[PDB]
Amino acid sequence: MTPDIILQRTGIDVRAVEQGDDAWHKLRLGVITASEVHNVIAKPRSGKKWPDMKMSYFHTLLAEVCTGVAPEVNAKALAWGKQYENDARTLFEFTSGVNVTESPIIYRDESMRTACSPDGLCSDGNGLELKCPFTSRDFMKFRLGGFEAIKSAYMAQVQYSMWVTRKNAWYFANYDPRMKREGLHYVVIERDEKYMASFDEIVPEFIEKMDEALAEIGFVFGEQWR
Amino acid sequence: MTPDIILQRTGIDVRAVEQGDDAWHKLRLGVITASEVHNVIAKPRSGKKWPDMKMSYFHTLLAEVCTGVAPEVNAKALAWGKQYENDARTLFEFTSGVNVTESPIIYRDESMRTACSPDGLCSDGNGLELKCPFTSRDFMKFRLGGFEAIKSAYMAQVQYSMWVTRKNAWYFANYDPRMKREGLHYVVIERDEKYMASFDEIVPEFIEKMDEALAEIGFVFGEQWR
Amino acid sequence: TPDIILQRTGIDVRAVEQGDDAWHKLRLGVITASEVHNVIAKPRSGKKWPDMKMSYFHTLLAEVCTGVAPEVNAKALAWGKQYENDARTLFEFTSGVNVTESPIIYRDESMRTACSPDGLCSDGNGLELKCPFTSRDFMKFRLGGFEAIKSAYMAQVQYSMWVTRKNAWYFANYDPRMKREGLHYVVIERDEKYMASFDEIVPEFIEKMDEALAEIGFVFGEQWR
DNA sequence: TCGGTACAGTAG
C-alpha cells in the first residue's frame, strides 16, 4: 500500500490527516477496524449463529457503506481518552526509551477492507496501543494485573493490529494522570498465531457476507468514497 | 367509544391533540399501551411468578396513576423522529399511494385501560407504525432480514395495536433519511389470533392486579385525570 | 472520634455537610455502607472474589493512590439533594422522632470502615432516607415493604449498624411526585448474620488492599497526609 | 423456584 493508492480509491491524501478528523472518519467507513474486530471473532455459546453484537457490527458497517456517514458519539469517558493520549505517548517514550512516530491509518491490503490506526510505531519495530482509562479503577486493574487482566476486546484489537501491519510484537500502555506515582504501565504483547489464524478464517467470511448483503439491496463497497 | 366520552372521563378534547404534546402524554397515564405491552405478556421460563420486567412496568403504570406524571424519556431519539416524521409520512404516501390520517390515541373500550397511539391510519383499513430509527444500523437490520428481523417488542406492539383497534392488518415501516437511496422499507403484518388470545388472557388479569394494588394504597384508576 | 480525625486529615468534622468538599475527602479509600454490598458478595461459582468485589477492590485502591474520586450517578444524587430537607421534615412529622444530621461515622481508629447516615433519630435509631429517582421504585417499596428492599440496601443498612454499634435503623423512601402518601418507611433490626459476615470478611478485604497497595509502594492514609 | 453474579448487548 501507498499514500498514493489511497488517493485513487477515496480522493483523500492520507498524510494531511489527523486521527479524529473528517478525513479520518471517512477513511474508516465500512472498513473492519482493530477496535471493533472483537465483534467479528465473537462466537455463540453454541451453534453456528452469529451472536447479536456481531450482527450489530455487521449491520453498522453495511449502514456506513450505504449512508456514507458515521454517527458522531460523545461522552466524558471518550473525551478523556482523547485528551490525554498525547501525554500518555510522551511519558511512554520517556520511560521505555523508544521513539514513537505517529501513524494515521494502515490498511492491510489493496482491498481496503481491513484497517487499524496505531497509537504509534516504535523505533524498535513494535507498534503501540495507548489507553487512558477514564476510571482510575481500570488503570489500577491493569497496573496490578498486567498481561492477564487485559480484556479480550483489547487483545483482539492488538493482535488484529499485528495481522494488519505484519508486525511481531506490540506495546500495550495505560496512562492515568491522576495517579500521584506509578501512572504509566505497559507490557509487550507477542503476535499470537492462534489469533492470526482465526482472522485469516473469519475476516474473509465477514467480508464475503457483507458483499452478499449489499448486492441484495443494490449497493457496492466503495460507494461510501465515491 | 368516541370523543365526547374522553372529555367526560379525562377533561381532554382529543381533537386539539397531536402526537406527542402535553395532553398526548396525559391520555396515556396509567394506560397499557402498545409500545410497552411486551412487558405485560412476558412469562417466566418455568412457574407463574411475574418476571422482573413485568413487575417493573406494573409499578411504572401504578406510579403514573398516583403521581400523574411520566418522566420525560429518550429526548435524542424523539427529536430525530419528530424532525423526520413528516417526510417519512409524505414518502410512505407517495410510495404506497395510500392516504394517511393521523390518530392521537385509540382506547380499546369504555374502561380505557388499554390503548395504542399509531403513527397513522391508512385509507385502505390498515394502521401505521412508521419509525425513524436513531441508528442507520437498525434501519439496515430490518431492510435485510425483513419480517424475521423485527424487534420481538415490536411484533407485540403491532399485534396489540390490532387487538386494540380490532383491525386485521398493519404497515410496519422504517425511514432513514441518511440512506443515499431506498431509505423507506415497509412490510404488512397480519393479525395473529395466537397474540389476540394472549391478550385476552393476560391483559384482564394485569388490570385486576393493578386494581388491587391501587386499592391497597387508597387510590383509584382515573385519579390521574382528575 | 472527632479528635483523632484531625491527626490524620487536619479536618474539623464540624464544618461538614452531606455532599460538600471536605466530606468527599474523608471517604477516600474508606469502605462505606453505600458500597459494602460489593465486599460481601459471594462468587456465583468457585471461591475466588467475584467481579464486583474486584471492581470495588480496584476502585478504592485508586482512591488511595489518586487522592480523588469521580462523581458517579449525578442525576439521582442531585434529585436526593433537592428533596433532602422535605423528606426529613415529612419523616419527622410522620414518625414523631426528631432527626439530627450526621456526617461520616467511622467504626474505629483504623478509619477503614465508615458510613454516612441520613440521620440519627431521637429514639436511638439511625435513618436511611432515599428519594428514589423513579416513582416506580417508590411504588415497589410502598407495595412490597421490608422484603422488596434490594440486597445492596439491606447490606447498606446492616453495615451502618455494624459501624455505629446500633440495634435498629429506619429505612425510608420519599417521593414528592406522589399526589399523597409519598412517605413510606420501616424499621430494620440489627441482624447478627450480617454482623458476623462483616466481622469475618471486612478485615480480610482490608488486608488484601494493604498488600495490594504495598506492591505499588503506596500506603493507606496517603490520600490525606 | 429463588437469590443472586457475570456478561452480552447497546447507548452515549
Next chain:
DNA sequence: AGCTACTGTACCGA
C-alpha cells in the same frame, strides 16, 4: 477511537 455505564438475559448452586 474514545472507555465507560448502564440494563436486562443467561447461568450457577442452594
